[PDB]
From Swiss-Prot:
Protein name (record): DIS3-like exonuclease 1
Membership in a protein family: Belongs to the RNR ribonuclease family.
Cell compartment(s), UniProt: Cytoplasm
Subunit composition and interactions: Component of the RNA exosome complex. The catalytically inactive RNA exosome core (Exo-9) complex is believed to associate with catalytic subunits EXOSC10, and DIS3 or DIS3L in cytoplasmic- and nuclear-specific RNA exosome complex forms.
RNA sequence: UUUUUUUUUUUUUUUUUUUUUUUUUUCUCCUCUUUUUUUUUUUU
């Protein structure tokens, strides 16, 4: 049963990964999401998507230390 | 008015046999980063 569990989890992750496949995310209106947080880490705060349901740790600090501002 | 003679197609057939796919090289080798590892639950 635990193996089955892992199967559903990584199968669905892969199915979502192809939702974000090659078909150009530049002109099809399937690009912008929203975001809340739930936990702080030392390079990027953990993000969440209420409209799809995906998680993942992002980064504010980038490789060249070129940290973000906004206009 | 122009007779007579000068051989031709090698002889032979009534011999035994108890093996067996292939076949014969090439060295040691830096796997990058949010984690502990999540977990009940219900609709197949």
């Amino acid at each position: 049963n635990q193996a089955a569990q892992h199967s559903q989890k990584q199968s669905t992750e892969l199915f979502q990964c192809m939702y974000f496949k090659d078909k150009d995310p530049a002109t099809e209106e399937r690009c912008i999401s929203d975001g809340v947080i739930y936990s702080i880490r030392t390079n990027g705060v953990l993000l969440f998507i209420p409209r799809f349901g995906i998680k993942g740790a992002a980064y504010l600090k980038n490789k060249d230390g070129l940290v973000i501002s906004c206009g």
